[PDB]
Amino acid sequence: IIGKVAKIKYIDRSVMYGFDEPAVVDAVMRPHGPNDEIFGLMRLRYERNLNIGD
Amino acid sequence: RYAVASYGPTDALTGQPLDGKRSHGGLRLGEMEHWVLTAQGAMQTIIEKSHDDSDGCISYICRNCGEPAIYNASHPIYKCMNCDVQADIGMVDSRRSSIVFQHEMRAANVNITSVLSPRVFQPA
Amino acid sequence: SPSICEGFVQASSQTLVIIPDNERITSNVLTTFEATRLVAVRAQQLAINGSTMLKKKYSSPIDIAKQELFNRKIPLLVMRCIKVTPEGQKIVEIWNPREMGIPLLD
Amino acid sequence: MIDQKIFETTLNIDDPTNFCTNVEAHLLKELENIYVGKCFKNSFILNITGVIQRSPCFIMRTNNSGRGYMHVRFSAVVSYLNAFDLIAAVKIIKNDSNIILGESLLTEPVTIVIPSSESQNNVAEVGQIVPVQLANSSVYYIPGRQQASATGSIFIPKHTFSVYHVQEELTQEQALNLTKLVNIIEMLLESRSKKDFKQICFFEKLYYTYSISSDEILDLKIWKGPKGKEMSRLKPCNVLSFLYDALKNKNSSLGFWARPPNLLKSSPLAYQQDQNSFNATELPIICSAEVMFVTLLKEIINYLQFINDLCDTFNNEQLIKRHENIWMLIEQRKIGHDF
Amino acid sequence: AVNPIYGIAAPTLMGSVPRIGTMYSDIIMDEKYITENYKS
Amino acid sequence: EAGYAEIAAVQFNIAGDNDHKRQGVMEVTISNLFEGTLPAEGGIYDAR
Ligand SMILES: [Zn+2]
């Protein structure tokens, strides 16, 4: 869900979606942190009906 | 909702699964669950869960001195660093957190010697 | 001055003393633990070999082992360790599950 | 040597139902497959004599494998090498600057690693077969290995000897004990008697401490010794005859016993005296008849084995000439008749 | 201190299983029945 | 070749100098942790 490469040639510090139910990318942004550095921000949304167990 | 299968992330020290769903690890059969399974007499379930599914391993111990030995079938190593010619290695089923536990006791200058069960023989 | 392994002497080997059949004191009925263990061991060993004298055909090791226990064809013996003498003996009772009472395993 | 040893092991059975259809045959097969040709408990296993004592096939309890295990006490023919023994054949395979590596040929698989000294690297080469002398307890039997590592020295027969002062009699039951060694010597002699006279004679001439001007060193049937100008006023005594007489208790074994280098090491002869008149450089050792007899019998067996193995290895004179350089290196260490 | 292994906690800390319940009695293979009923 | 065994008892003792010098497989000599990718030989991270 977020690609990420790192110069040392490269090692893959990528991010995987480890949840049982599929989500949908609602909104993604590239803002600046406190030290003025770009970081990845992903919002994941779920369509939740009432279901057995709620 | 949560479910794991036979494999996944493992703790570096103890060799057991990680802690729960957040870490993609396993769930816990705590102290009180072993009390219940011991009360039921279910010992082959305790092997399956606490050994075959948590952190079971094989420990090698020399008969003649009770100390851990070094055994490797492929790339043949059969040696004890305490006898070196009187080595009599028997494999005991253990689990990694217990071997870590005995090394933590030896690191504090308390020596742990394991007396193995003796050989038994029919007469004549 | 020495190591602990110096004075360590391994436990001496034992002789298996078998109580004769007429002086056995334990029950001639399998406990539920003993029947469960016999069926478990036999089922795993059927998962290894598959050779059995059971006349009817089953598709599971567990069913074969259960019917072998029930029909008295299970090729195992039950060793009940009574005592370990400090002179170096192991007094045990050998019980043949083909000739014992089988508990209620519903 | 070669003798019997009783071992204890625990075998894992991966298929108990099949294994128990014939326990004796399967047990012999597995013992042979695991232990034959390997080092185990300070010994090297040659053959499996039999299974003395076994246990039932227990089912393993600490795992759900359904597998079995069986405790076995078995008797095996093994070969234990003694300190400072004498091998007759080794093929040097590695000749480096640091160490020399060779392997025994006649005896059981043995690796001999001679530490390289400056006087050794310029003589021994790859392809040569030489006799070696061992060292004290350097024959470590590291378990699981197919050979017995031992450091050794290129053999040159010594010029010294030992003297044993015995003050206790050789009893009858200890003579019964040494009967095995006497019988071993008898078998070694009857095995040597088949060989060609020239090979045994030349090897004896090479490895005799002194030199003798031919045809004066060997009387196979009687062992009368070398006829050199009657050096000693007392005839050397046959060890076998003395033991057979002490079986019937007709002679006494007290006094000073010595085997000077002039004596033939492979013969059963030795010197006994009531007073210490041996020209030894070392003090005589006060000991009983048991120790002295054991040491002398073991030396006789070792030297008979050495001569037998030398004669077996070099069946042709071409190889003798190929190894003649070692023969002369031995020869220059001999002592002449300047006495 | 020599600590014989018995009970629950002593075998559990040593990585083994208690000799209890299904593991109280030892099972051995019936040789005399297998040599006369099975084949290799 | 290693037969099946079970621990029957555990003996507790005090470990001395000889026990450490006979059980230990190597001696820590340097304070270098890593020479390269592999751990430094003789340090506290040695592969022995
Ligand atoms: Zn040891």
The per-residue DSSP string of D154-192 comes to E----S---EEEE-S---HHHHHHHHHHHHHHHHHHHHH
Tell me if D34 sits within 8 A of D43, measured CB to CB. Answer: no
Backbone phi, psi, residue F46, to 5°: -60, 145
Structure tokens at D319: 């190889």
Rg from Cα positions in chain F: 17
Q: Do residues C92 and C18 touch, judged by C-beta distance below 8 A?
A: yes
Nearest residue in chain C measured CA to CA from B110: C4
Chain B partners within 8 Å of D140 (Cβ):
84-85
Please answer whether residues D21 and D36 qualify as being in contact, where contact means their C-beta atoms are separated by less than 8 angstroms.
Answer: no
* C-alpha to C-alpha distance for D234 and D257, rounded to whole angstroms: 13
Q: How far is the C-alpha of D141 from the C-alpha of C28, rounded, in Å?
A: 51
Other beta carbons within 10 angstroms of residue C33's beta carbon come to: 18
Burial status of residue D311 (CB atoms within 10 A of its CB: 0-12, 13-18, 19 or more): buried
Distances (CA, A) of C56 to C60, D136, D279: 12, 68, 91
The strand ranges marked E within chain B are 56-62, 70-72, 77-79, 89-95, 110-116, 120-121
Measured CA distances, E3 to B47, B65, B94, D97, D270 (Å) = 23, 16, 17, 54, 60
Closest-CA residue to E31 (of C79, D53, D56, B119): D56
Neighbours of C68 (CB within 10 A): 24
Cα F45 to chain centroid distance, Å, stands at 11
Query: Do B9 and B24 meet the contact criterion of CB atoms below 8 Å apart?
Result: yes
User: For residue C84, how many other CB atoms are within 10 A of its CB?
Assistant: 15
Please classify residue D192 by burial: count the beta carbons closer than 10 Å to its beta carbon, then call 0-12 exposed, 13-18 middle and 19+ buried: middle
Please state the length of chain F.
48
Cβ–Cβ pairs < 8 A, chains B and E: 42
Cα–Cα separations (whole angstroms), residue E25 to C101, C102, D61, D186, F20: 16, 15, 10, 57, 40
To which H or E segment does residue B101 belong? helix B96-106
Report yes or no: D74 and D7 within 8 Å, Cβ to Cβ. yes
Residues D337, E13: Cα–Cα separation, whole Å: 78
Task: For residue D95, give the amino acid letter.
Answer: N
Record the tokens describing residue A54, joined without a space: 């709620």
Separation in Å, CA of B105 to nearest CA in chain E: 12
Residue F21 host element (H or E): helix F17-23
Q: Which of D225, D203, D153, D215 is nearest to D331 (CA)?
A: D203
Q: Which helix (H) or strand (E) holds B9?
A: none
CA-CA distance, B25 to B5, in Å (whole number)? 10
Residue whose entry in the numeric block shows the structure tokens 């000799």: E19
Tokens of D144: 């699981």
Tokens of D209: 């401490």
List all residues 6 or more positions away from D97 whose beta carbon is below 8 Å from its beta carbon: D116, D121
C-alpha triplet D295, D299, D304: angle, nearest 5°:
150
For residues B81 and B70, the answer to whether their CB atoms sit within 8 Å is: yes
Which of B81, B104, B111 to probe by mutation at the F interface, max F CB count within 10 Å?
A: B111
In whole angstroms, give the CA distance from residue C102 to residue C36. Answer: 10
Look at residues D175, D319, D324, D190 and name the one whose alpha carbon lies nearest to residue D251: D175
Alpha carbons A34 and D132: distance in angstroms, whole number = 80
D47 forms beta bridges with D77
Contact check, Cβ <8 Å, D18/C49: yes
Taking the centre of ligand 1 as the mean of its atom positions, its distance from the CA of residue E27, in whole angstroms, is: 30
CA separation for the pair B26, B37 (Å, rounded):
19
Q: What count of other Cβ atoms lies within 10 Å of the Cβ of residue D139?
A: 21
**What is each CA distance from D38 to D42, D47, D120, D301, in whole angstroms?**
11, 10, 31, 25
Question: In chain D, which ranges are E strands?
Answer: 3-13, 45-54, 58-59, 68-78, 86-87, 90-95, 99-104, 111-115, 132-133, 153-154, 163-166, 237-238, 255-258, 269-273, 285-287
In chain F, what are the helix, strand and coil shares in percent, each to the nearest 5? 15, 25, 60
* C76 interfaces chain E, CB cutoff of 8 Å: yes
Q: Do chains C and F touch (3 or more CB pairs under 8 A)?
A: yes
Whether residues E26 and D21 touch (CB distance < 8 A) is answered with: no
Is residue D285 helix, strand or coil?
strand
**What is the CB neighbour count within 10 angstroms for residue D115?**
11
- C-alpha span between E10 and D300 (Å, rounded): 58
CA distance D22 to E40: 8
* Euclidean distance between CA atoms D195 and D315, whole angstroms: 10
User: What technique determined this structure?
Assistant: cryo-EM
Six token digits for residue D114:
């001679």
D235 — contact with chain C (CB < 8 Å)?
no
Q: What whole-number distance in Å separates Cα of residue C94 and Cα of residue D187?
A: 50
From the number of C-beta atoms within 10 Å of its C-beta (0-12, 13-18, 19+), residue A49 rates as exposed
Q: Is B44 on the interface with E (CB under 8 A)?
A: yes
d(CA C100, CA D316): 75
* Angle CA B45–C30–B40, to nearest 5: 30
Q: Give the residues after which the backbone of chain C is interrupted, taking a C-to-next-N distance over 2.5 angstroms as a break.
A: none
CA D75 – CA D5 distance, rounded (Å):
6
Q: Is B32 helix (H, G, I), strand (E, B) or coil?
A: helix
Polymer length in residues for chain D: 339
Q: Which helix or strand (DSSP H or E) is residue A25 part of?
A: strand A24-29
Instruction: Identify which of B97, B102, B124 has the alpha carbon closest to the alpha carbon of residue B114.
Output: B102
The reply to whether residue B81 touches residue F15, judged by beta carbons under 8 angstroms, is no
Structure tokens at D18: 């099949």
Closest Cα of chain D to B78: distance in Å?
A: 6
In angstroms, what CA-CA distances link D114 with B47, B73, D331? 52, 30, 22
CA distance C91 to D298: 46
Residue whose pair of structure tokens reads 């005090």 in the numeric block: F14
Cβ neighbours around A26 below 10 Å, total: 10
Q: Which residues pair with D236 in a beta bridge?
A: none
- What is the nearest CA distance from B4 to chain A, expressed in angstroms? 11
Q: Contact D21/E40 with Cβ under 8 angstroms? A: yes
The DSSP symbol for D81 reads P
Q: Which two tokens stand for residue D90?
A: 């080794």
Which residues make beta-bridge pairs with F11? B113, E2
In angstroms, how far is CA D316 from the centroid of its own chain?
24
Counting other chains too, the contacts that D177-185 makes at CB distance below 8 Å and 24 or more residues apart are D178/D243, D178/D293, D178/D294, D178/D297, D179/D243, D181/D294, D181/D297, D181/D298, D181/D301, D182/D240, D182/D243, D182/D244, D182/D297, D184/D301, D185/D240, D185/D268, D185/D297, D185/D300, D185/D301, D185/D304
Contact E29 D22 (CB under 8 A): no
Strand partners, B19: B26
Expressed in percent and rounded to 5, the helix, strand and coil fractions of chain C are 35, 20, 45
Nearest to B41 among C12, C16, C33 (CB): C33
